[PDB]
Amino acid sequence: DSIIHIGAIFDESAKKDDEVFRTAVGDLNQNEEILQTEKITFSVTFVDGNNPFQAVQEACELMNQGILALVSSIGCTSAGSLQSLADAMHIPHLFIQRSTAGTPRSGCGLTRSNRNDDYTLSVRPPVYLNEVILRVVTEYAWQKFIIFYDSEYDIRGIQEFLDKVSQQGMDVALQKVENNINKMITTLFDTMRIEELNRYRDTLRRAILVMNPATAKSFISEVVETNLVAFDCHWIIINEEINDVDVQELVRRSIGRLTIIRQTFPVPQNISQRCFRGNHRISSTLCDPKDPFAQNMEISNLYIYDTVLLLANAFHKKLQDRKWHSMASLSCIRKNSKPWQGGRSMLETIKKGGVNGLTGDLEFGENGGNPNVHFEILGTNYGEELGRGVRKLGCWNPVTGLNGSLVVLRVVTVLEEPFVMVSENVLGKPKKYQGFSIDVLDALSNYLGFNYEIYVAPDHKYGSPQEDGTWNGLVGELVFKRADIGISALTITPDRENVVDFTTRYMDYSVGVLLRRSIQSLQDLSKQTDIPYGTVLDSAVYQHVRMKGLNPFERDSMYSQMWRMINRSNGSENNVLESQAGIQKVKYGNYAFVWDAAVLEYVAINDPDCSFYTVGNTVADRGYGIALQHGSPYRDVFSQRILELQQSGDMDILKHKWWP
Template sequence: MTVGILLAAATTVVAGGNPDEVLLRTPRRYGYSMFSIGAVLDDQDSGTEIAMYTGLKAVAHNFQNITTMDIVKIPKANFANATNNVCELLKRGVVALISPLDPLIRQSVRMVAKQFHIPLIETHWDTDRSNARFAINVHPAHDAFGEAIFEYLSSYLKWTHVVLILADYGNIVKHTAWLNNFEGTLIIRTLGPDKLNWKPIIAELAATDSRNFLLDIPYWYAKDFLVLAYVHNMTGEQYNYVFSDWDTHLLDLTPFKIEDGASIFTFSIVPSIGQYKSYGRGPFVEALRPEIYKRERARRYSDILPFLPAYAALTYDAMLLLGVALLNLKDSISVRPGALTCERGSQASWPDGEKLIQYIKSPNISNIPTITGDIHFDSHGYRSNFNMSILSLQDNGMYQIGYWTQRDRLQITQPIKRKRKVPKKPLTSVVLRVTTVPDTPFVIPKKYDAYGNPLKTPDAWDGYCVDLLNLIAADVGFNYTIEITKDHYGSRQRNNETGEYYYDGIIGVVNRGLPHLCPSIGFLEMLLRTLCEAALTITYEREMVLDFTTPFMTLGGSLLFMRPKTQKPSIFSFLQPLSPTVWAYVITTYIVVSVGLFLVARLSPYEWQNPHPCEAFSEEKENQFTVLSSFWFFITPLLNQANLAAFLTVDTTELPIESVEDLVAQTKIKYGTLQSGASHDFFKQSKIPVFQQMWQFMSKHDVFVQNTKQGIERVLKGDYVFIMESSWNEYYNKRDCRLMQIGRLLDTKGYGIGLQQGSPYRDPISESILKLQKAQTLDQLKRKWWTEFNISEPCTNAKDSSKEAKPLGIEQVGGVFVLLIIGFFWAFIVSVIEFCVHNKACTKSQGDLFAEMWKELKFAMRCMTPSTRAKPTTPVIHEPAPTSNPMMVGGSAKELEHMVDHKHLDPVSVQSQNLLVVPVAESNEVLLSSSGDTTSSGSSSVGESYPPPPPPPQANSSAVSPWSHLNNNQRKPPSEGENWWRISQSAV
């Protein structure tokens, strides 16, 4: 809320009895004249109120010529009442007005002052001078302030890159003067009043290479900003912060002044004095100082120093200036302008207002003990030739290093000299800032903030480089934090506008003069210095701008390719051991051999058999080796497992490319590298023809990728080779069996730790690396991160074409089992058909067919019984002996039983079987026995009467045997001694 304050003869209206307000409640009389001064202020702005009274008291005390002054507060609830409040002040006959801070209310007050010719005194930043004919501003003009900023940033600090941070974007108007002249790189960010929104903005700036910041924020926000900057590792010695708020020196910023920390500057129009020293402006200023200090602590920030803020000093000086002007003109102007009214139609104004405002602008007023120095104004009412102190944060607080005036321009009285200190071991007080690019397995973020950004602390990271850094830090003795650079490793670039060359990425961060450490891949330089950690390769070009330590890993360029996909084998893969030509020969051979077997079987006498065993003298012979049997007999060797063994030696992997030369000789498969980095520069600068040809191809096609992950994804899509360092290649193809390295290494290089040239830390770090190599710690680290980390099932070398083939699976030989099952079922069906046909033929005269089949089936299914069915015992039938055709019987009992059972005895077959014919005495019964023994009818279990043999076969038999051309006389007679007899019917 805003109130109107009338400095006039009236009653003091102040609530409460606060002793801090004693200056307000004690009216005093000095001299004989009385002037009324009105002000429109914020109802909470008691500091300005105190400064106004203190300034007028100082005038009364020094010049002894002013009347009683009291306060009358006119409350203002809203903006609409501001004009009414000013009009109320005019009715009281004020000779001057003090402008409010609010720019909208200020415009209302200006319009009233302009209409009634009442001088208006302003004490705040002002960029709009409309309706300001009767207004003057004791605050420095923004144009002059811009000149001072420009000279300081460009001439002294020599900044070519600036980040302007504003509390409110409207404040940018204050900086237009120097922004119009600044020719460097400029970034503008607005924080806003909500501190929760600051963090992502600061995090964004931390990720850039910005190191120079100009902050136009209220002084009570400065500490909060620096705390966030510290969290984001933005307080190293390479950072510079310039706070434009006049009151930044009120804060104790010494906690941020650490060894090799950031440079912090500010400006002030209040003289820089010690905390316990006097401003030298008399007792009223020293009395004002503690009063303002108490109110600022309660209103703004509790942790401030007991110095005067700029607004209090400017208000004090304004009242001092106005009081002296009124006293000097007391005899030439009316003490009171009279009662002025804002009512419609009123044309009255104060005729002496023009004289008073011109007198204040004139240089006639001088030698006034103001706090901010001599006050002069230009024709527009702006303060000119002010004295701006330049302060720098030192160990004991803010210290003045120079000043700026419009007459003397920039004057640096105490230049800051930064000396690089030689480190001493251990470096426990040194903090290294690691600038890195996350890339597994070298640098892996583990913990993130609420915005998804990796944290800066060491425990929030993991990986080979982090482990290496921890070992080096423990040996050398330093601490560190980690941050990310967004433009990767970096390469040499050319500025088309200036023609100059520069490095981007991690190399660029170091090359621009920022200290870095990059283990694994990087740089080290002590800070609160920066360390850049990523897979940084030692190259000649980088050696030109950096110093590298002993390499801790050797590697080379390599080709990453997708392993050719093996098609799912067909179920008849067992046919693959032989080529189609061989299979044609096999089939031809199969047919020829099968036919040959059939012909041989037809020619061989041992393949011919009597189809009717009961007809001993039958000339019909049968050859069971048919054409079908011949073909089936020879098919089994084709399915022999020995043939499948040949399949195991067949190379099923066929690579489309096997070397760099193969890659260049084709155009279907694209190849590329990272967008920037050592591999990119290798091809770009190579003088080897094949590599030059590859670079020309890559330059014409869209083959470059932003990071390793993108390159691998493109490889897995097919028809792309990613050229990468062998360390990465080895890591990824151990985890993804779809990837493989092809060809030999393209070159040989190493990873090292890079430092700024001339850095005294290279030798200690190199010694530490050599110690780790000697202890085989580096080998253990690589084994941990390459062969053990994040591997659930490692890819074996079984898939390499040069390795042993794996045994055949069911996918390859499943067809054999399919054919086996088909053959089994076909054989079973055929056997069932044969079974049914045979039983039907045998049971035509023996009863029911199904009963007989069931009987035979039960017998066949008895697995534990003999496979030969026993014949039932049959009594011997006595029959008269034949009268002719004596018969000879012999052989085994079983065979003889078969022959007797069928009542057929062929003398020839008896002779050939060595059978004995034993006569039975006193009867026509004949007992048959083997081995020359004779048995009687009572003791023989094998014997049977038989009819006369059938007549011999006729000459016109349907089947002619191989021996049919022989008659009985040509057959071989039995030799002497053989146990067989010719028995005649009469002998029996």
């Protein structure tokens, strides 16, 4: 019937270990994989992980009843005391180390009885955290960075790395982060003067978050909010308790470069062996990822499934190899204590076993340990039809260390000044175009080693939305793949996003007003209505005004006057049909023309008469990008070069050529 009865000591935070433990015994009792004749029965006892005496007391009472295996999942506080209890009384001990609060792993290290043979098998794998963080910083060549750690974190896990940064002369700051971060960060600014604030900003370009996921998400919102984000920003998140759900949330919260480093759990590639180990079927909670329980499993749970299986292997072979000892009389701590003699031969059978599980292979040495673990190295996201992505930069495992390191284009443009101006004609035909965007082409082409030919768009406009769901003009050239690339001031807006592929911004969209020689702003503009104003018929500025003026959600007195103005005589009295047409209309009449502020300022400054004046406000999260084919491959390389240019400030010299 059943002659194998085992004891388990779980903390109150080890309830999931109790669930996986109970399921695994259940899987074995329903599957004739090992020692079918004998079943596994259990007694489960709950203790404090912060009281070493209480763990020992209840464990001894399990021994008085009689037990042949002992499994603990508990922290490192009571670890040395359970380890010594195992050693003296000879009960083989499967110790599942828990790391505090779901912060990155750190070891225990807590000594045990040394007057006995060791009965502790360390189930968990060693800390390789110091080595991992070093490989990753070295590939990026970091020499100055800041390590942010939470209160939950024990700093032992990076100690050999801390010694290393000092030896290699790296300028590494440490700061503890704790609750009320949004206040803590305001207060830190208040006490640092400008000189120190400058030192702090420089450190923030390269930072490591060494912390539990709750603090990490709250911290990311705050560093974004305080403008320590930069185009060169680079965050490394390391935590072995990171999972795919955390990666997807962490990636959305940050901008720039993210590196996400987590431990991963290797499982069979074959679709029928996901929930099989041989002929033994695994329960649809330990191999079913569509469950709420399953996605949120710690690493400790996976080893508990393997521990029970491995125990079952040991009991069978212990019966089969005919060395079997049954449950026996043991007594604890009064005036007599008695060791178990079946413990040594039970320990040896468990020790020299090994199983296939969800961690890969679990097997034990003299003192145990699993050398086989895999880490995956994840990176920054990208725009995709699935949403933001995450991808493998490389892999790290202890075994092989780090693996992986960490044409003529058809150019369509639009003749809009000063962004595109024809500079030189030869025999009355253009030879050279100049302007902000043309000069930018020359910068991409020479570095990337593509050649270009430029033709101007067919309607000489930035397209228009169609009822068949296409676009015409320059936009249109990219949709129908007539032009491979577009070089022009094409504003990055939502309409254009889903029809052409945009690279990152390198010059900001701005909205202003060109006025005849008291209006110092667009708020000021909206207050009067005595100088007629409008914009180009059916532009982005035109629909935006119509939108605000027809908006139930947010109203200002601004939008009501603006809406009454745009919509005078069926909204067409005061509108003009081309941007040029507005510019003269201010010049040779009483009119104010709303347009891009950078075009009207260039016009006003350089006018011979100085018969124009201009004010205008910048527009964030709007700016010109290189528009491309749908599914164009070259977006990754254009984007990198764009980034470089802005950083070296070669791009800010392009902005000076037209606008001092």
